[PDB]
């Protein structure tokens, strides 16, 4: 089953719980999103290497560049929120009540 895949899936659950529960700063949430991205990258890359899946070996780098520009958009949104406020807490966002 290529035992390391279990550890990288457990690492995915680590990064996903770190993405979901997050106390104060949005930057930690965005960085754990980046960690989740790295987890998918590594897991799929080891799979494609051991498969000799040599034709469509584009998945690691292209998944990487797309979700990297996603993280760029997240950085710009966090800069905009921190620009119109003092800080970038999860609090001071309780306006616009559901």
């Amino acid at each position: 089953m290529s035992l390391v895949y279990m550890n990288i899936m457990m690492a995915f659950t680590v990064s996903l719980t770190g993405l979901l529960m997050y106390r104060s700063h949005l930057m930690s949430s965005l960085l754990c999103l980046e960690g989740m991205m790295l987890s998918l990258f590594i897991l799929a890359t080891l799979m494609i290497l051991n498969s000799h899946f040599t034709l469509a070996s584009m998945m690691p780098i292209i998944l990487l560049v797309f979700a990297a520009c996603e993280a760029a958009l997240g950085l710009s949104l966090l800069v905009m929120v921190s620009n119109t406020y003092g800080t970038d807490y999860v609090q001071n966002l309780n306006l616009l009540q559901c």
Binding site: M1, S2, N50, S51, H52, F53, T54, L55, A56
Partner: protein, 99 residues
């Protein structure tokens, strides 16, 4: 909905990133090439339901080529048995490099 301009224009621009055994830029195979060719030829002119209930044997052969689960289970059982019998001490092992 899923559309078919991919087939309609005659430009098969996206069917090459798709499976293995499409022609790599240097003509090399993957690790489970022939299993794929027989599985695709098993389930080609098929309505994807007798693919579920008829090509099961060759699909399991392809899956155990791809992951090698139970073959590693057999090898791991051999390793654990070898460890417990060398723990016992019978036939201080000539399976390594010599008699």
């Amino acid at each position: 909905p899923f559309f078919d301009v991919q087939k309609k224009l005659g430009v098969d621009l996206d069917h090459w990133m798709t499976i293995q055994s499409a022609e790599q830029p240097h003509r090399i195979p993957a690790r489970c090439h022939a299993f794929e060719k027989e599985w695709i030829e098993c389930a080609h002119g098929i309505g994807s339901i007798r693919a579920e209930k008829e090509c099961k044997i060759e699909f399991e052969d392809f899956r155990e080529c791809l992951l090698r689960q139970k073959t590693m289970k057999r090898l791991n059982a051999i390793k654990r048995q070898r460890d417990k019998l060398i723990k016992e001490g019978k036939y201080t092992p000539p399976p390594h490099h010599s008699g």
